[PDB]
């Protein structure tokens, strides 16, 4: 088929969501602007051919609020209106995902950088540029 799509299981949401929808809902209209948070060097094609099948999954949404509704439909408390799903999904993106990067009036660019770092960190292991983390490594314990 197409192969190797990227999704994002995020809390208080019943179903996984493709990451491009998450960056569109998070505040980024464009595609190059989304891609600048994930692939830090655009002259690497091997990143590009792996990142494009999840981009081609979601060229039907190009604006923020439709992606907000796409999240809020999947919500644990599914809103009945268009403007209740948006408030629920905006609450989730504001507070539920990634508290450690900031919960404030505007922390969307910083949360976007950390999420793009997570996607980049996934792509490096899927390409074998790095190695997988060990669960028993007691540096990773507290």
């Amino acid at each position: 088929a197409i192969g190797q799509r990227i999704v994002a299981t995020l809390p208080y949401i019943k179903q996984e969501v493709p990451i491009i929808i998450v960056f569109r809902a998070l505040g980024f209209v464009s595609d190059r602007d989304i891609l600048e948070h994930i692939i830090y060097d655009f002259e690497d094609p091997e990143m590009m051919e792996m990142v494009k099948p999840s981009l081609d999954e979601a060229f039907v949404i190009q604006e923020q609020n439709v992606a907000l509704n796409f999240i809020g439909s999947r919500g644990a408390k599914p809103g009945v209106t268009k403007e209740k799903r948006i408030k629920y999904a905006k609450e989730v993106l504001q507070k539920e995902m990634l508290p450690h990067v900031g919960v404030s009036d505007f922390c969307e660019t910083k949360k976007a950088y950390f999420l793009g770092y997570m996607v980049h960190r996934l792509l490096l292991a899927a390409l074998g540029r790095r190695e997988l983390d060990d669960r028993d490594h007691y540096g990773n314990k507290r």
Partner: protein, 147 residues
């Protein structure tokens, strides 16, 4: 490293880890990070000197304590993440001398190897002469002895 060895701003518990191949550089400040103290090694020589041992041997008069030894920039606290990006030596005599060269880029040394043991395993005499499932059974039966 210059600041943490002087305790200017960065307290000793904070860990700095530079990953080189992956360009990331992390700093951790949290609670729950397990760490142990190590000596510091410049070019091939210890930062610990005769004068430190002399000032600290006549403790209870000078009170040149462990904390003054930390403050001098002679020991560090190293946790597990920072222990991956570093090169240690077991014994400064046998491992920092001219020979068929192994590393010659050491960074730290250990104070004594017998500080890898615990409490109940630190009462076993000659434990490196036993088979290792015996040291476990003695580390269990040391909690059951009468005294």
């Amino acid at each position: 490293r210059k600041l943490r060895r002087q305790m200017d701003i960065i307290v000793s518990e904070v860990s700095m880890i530079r990953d080189i191949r992956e360009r990331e550089i992390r700093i951790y400040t949290d609670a729950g990070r397990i760490c142990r103290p190590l000596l510091i090694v410049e070019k091939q020589k210890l930062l610990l000197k005769k004068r430190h041992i002399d000032q600290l041997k006549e403790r209870e008069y000078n009170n040149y304590s462990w904390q003054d030894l930390v403050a001098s920039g002679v020991v560090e606290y190293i946790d597990t993440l920072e222990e991956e990006t570093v090169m240690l030596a077991m014994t400064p005599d046998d491992l920092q001398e001219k020979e068929v060269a192994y590393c010659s880029t050491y960074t730290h040394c250990e104070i004594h190897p017998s500080m890898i043991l615990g409490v109940c395993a630190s009462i076993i005499p000659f434990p490196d002469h036993n088979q290792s499932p015996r040291n476990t059974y003695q580390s269990a039966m040391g909690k059951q002895a009468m005294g």
